[PDB]
Design a protein around this ligand. Structure first.
Ligand code: HEM
Ligand code: HEM
Lengths: 68, 244, 28, 57, 244, 69, 57, 28
């Protein structure tokens, strides 16, 4: 058991609004999500999208060259 | 090279049963069954379908009772130990056109006409493919020769099919009076084949709309319940001595 | 509190039986 | 009004009965409503809408 | 009524395969198989027995091959789609006398000659029952009449059997030179039938003797091991203060 | 809850004792004990089974002889 | 038995190989002996003892 | 210097066991 010194104040769940906080400070929420995760999103989408479009391009060149 | 190997892609058609709240067109199912009886059934079996399945969908009980009775089914053995024939009942399956697979191939140039009970589910883009293949017999591209006994069909893989073109105008007489054009009969028969592969589509669709609507409401209550229970924790003020 | 609760749960059980098994037609 | 209301939040047996009744009626109401909209969206395509229904020959 | 209802109880005969180290008399199996294919097989099936089953038991590989070639087995369909006939092979089951159970009943006055593959396992005291029944045809007791088409046999429950007497003297001719009396053929055909019901008996009995002997040795070691571990407890001296 | 015991226990090693000869030691007294303590129990188990079985054979025999002409 | 103990029981790895060898060789010795008793108790009743074996017309 | 001897003695036990469970005398 860890020895902990702290003071905690809590409010009853029936004395606060439960759902309005979902849409509070939304521009901050969208800004934080993008600004911290854009590199992560790029590292995940770019190789799957780059490989896919290359394969489509290759199949188009391979099909056309086999024609007459 | 490989373009013929895969086959020409089938376009998308606005089938009356497409859509999250769309039923089958039962008048077209009954018409497509008549097309099956008079055209397809000569060499295609539908062994998963029985006469009692048509009742309540496209025919009445007495209509399907009569229809079964016009066919002959091997029954027995009798008390003497010999097989006999009898008029069919509602529980009987649709008649097979051939005794076995080897007999089917021998009567069709060695190619086997597949069973049509699940064909719309057994091919990629099944409904649109069956409609396009039925109505897609045209002359081959230049430089392409089709060996004897086969017919050109770009939607069929490889291009050369062993089934002759059998959807021709006026090949069926419709009881309702609608013109039995090639597109009409191709549309009606794919409607019948769609129901034959997925007879539970309507019950399944009605369950989906009701329960996804109810489950979405349960998601709202569950979100409120979680947030209500966690609110005492999420709003609490914690005072400690540490700074950095 | 003992008989009232017993009748209340007996009502809940009977309603639940009518809800799970729905014999609307067995009222004959 | 108040009598049933007061009983629901004071006795869990009444509340459980209330849940069962609400589940039963809410389920039937949705099934009735879903089928009405299914019928409105599929006019003419039902088995009972076949013109030649009953004359096979 | 009272005593005829179960029938007359069969005796206990000394079968050569009885005893914990006793095998089948293989010469009597081969002899009893000739009785089957010359008397029994015209009305009784043995559908569980193949021609390969006899190889290494009563017949050689060549003998069993020539045996199966003597019979006509249906097969197919051919590439044209019809059922044809071919000589039997070793993998083929022993042939059926009738086409189905109703044909069997029609040929035997409405009674079914049961399949004899498991009959000694399918009756109480089965080997002795089959022998006593086959050799137990005689005149009924005074005041007992038997319906025409039936024969009296006290070993049959009820005393009226649709089987006629089939084991008349010299009904078969043996290959080795054994006088084929009723009792001799009755012995041989039960040796054949008993082996057919339990073809694993010889391997089963060699396994049982081997392992029961070995497990007995382990039981002696198990007892010694248990006693060795517990001896420190069982011989301990315990001193306590209490008296009463 | 542990017990609180006071006792002296002497034990000898298993490899210093005869292991098997104790099975047939004073054999007659063992049989004497087994029959002496348990003859009432063996009678309450064997008598109803044998008695009821014997009556059933006695019943079936007589009933079989009354129906015989 | 102590001379035997010094060669085989001293190391478990050897004593394990001793139990595997005895399982092998003991099982084979019982197999042969049970088969010999079966042959001696069933003279003339075997498949190789059929007199007309190989002579079926 | 015993771990190498315990390894060699347990390999012999493993080899004897393998020849014992599978008995490939017809294949040798
Ligand atoms: C409207 C009537 C018919 C319909 C809807 C129909 C439907 C089909 C379908 C879905 C296939 C499978 C195509 C594939 O493999 O992807 C097929 C193949 C075939 N059909 Fe039919 N069929 C009809 C009538 C006939 C008739 C009348 C014949 C013969 C006289 C026939 C003989 C064949 C054969 C031989 C094949 C195999 C073709 C091949 O494997 O190359 N069919 N048919
Ligand atoms: C040696 C030759 C045969 C043997 C060993 C044999 C064996 C048997 C056996 C074990 C049964 C069973 C009786 C029971 O259920 O308790 C039976 C019944 C019967 N057998 Fe055979 N059988 C032989 C030949 C035949 C033949 C040649 C026929 C017809 C011509 C025949 C017709 C029947 C019939 C009709 C029954 C049933 C009678 C009844 O249940 O009332 N059997 N036989």
């Amino acid at each position: 058991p860890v020895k902990l010194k702290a003071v905690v104040y809590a409010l009853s769940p029936f004395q606060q609004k439960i759902m309005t906080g979902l849409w509070k400070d939304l521009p901050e929420k969208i800004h934080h999500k993008v600004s911290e995760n854009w590199i992560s999103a790029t590292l995940l989408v770019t190789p799957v999208v780059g490989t896919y479009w290359y394969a489509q391009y290759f199949k188009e060149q391979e099909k056309l060259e086999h024609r007459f | 090279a490989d373009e013929a190997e895969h086959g020409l892609e089938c376009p998308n058609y606005p089938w009356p049963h497409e859509g999250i709240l769309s039923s089958y067109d039962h008048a077209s199912i009954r018409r497509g069954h008549q097309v099956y009886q008079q055209v397809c059934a000569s060499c295609h079996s539908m062994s998963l379908i029985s006469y009692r399945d048509l009742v309540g969908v496209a025919y009445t009980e007495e209509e399907a009772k009569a229809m079964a009775a016009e066919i002959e089914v091997v029954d027995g053995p009798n008390d003497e130990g010999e097989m006999f024939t009898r008029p069919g009942k509602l529980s009987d399956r649709l008649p097979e056109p051939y005794s076995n697979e080897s007999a089917a191939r021998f009567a069709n140039g060695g190619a086997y006409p597949p069973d049509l009970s699940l064909v719309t589910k057994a091919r990629h883009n099944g409904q649109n493919y069956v409609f396009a293949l039925l109505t897609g017999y045209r002359d081959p591209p230049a430089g392409i020769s089709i060996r004897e006994g086969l017919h050109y069909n770009p939607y069929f893989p490889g291009g050369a099919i062993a089934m002759p073109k059998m959807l021709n105008d006026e090949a069926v007489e419709y009881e309702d009076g609608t013109p039995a054009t090639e597109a009409q009969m191709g549309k009606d028969v794919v409607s019948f084949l769609s129901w034959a592969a997925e007879p539970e589509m309507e019950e399944r669709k009605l369950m989906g709309f009701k329960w996804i609507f109810l489950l979405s409401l349960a998601l709202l209550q569950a979100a409120y319940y979680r947030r209500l229970k966690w609110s005492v924790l999420k709003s609490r003020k914690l005072v400690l001595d540490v700074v950095n | 509190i003992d008989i009232q609760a017993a009748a209340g749960w007996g009502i809940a059980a009977a309603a639940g039986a009518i809800w799970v098994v729905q014999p609307f037609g067995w009222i004959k | 009004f108040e009598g049933f209301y007061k009983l629901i939040m004071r006795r869990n047996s009444v509340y459980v009965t209330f849940i069962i009744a609400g589940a039963f009626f809410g389920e039937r109401a949705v099934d009735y409503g879903v089928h009405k909209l299914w019928e409105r969206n599929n006019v003419g395509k039902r088995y009972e809408d076949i013109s030649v229904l009953g004359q096979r020959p």
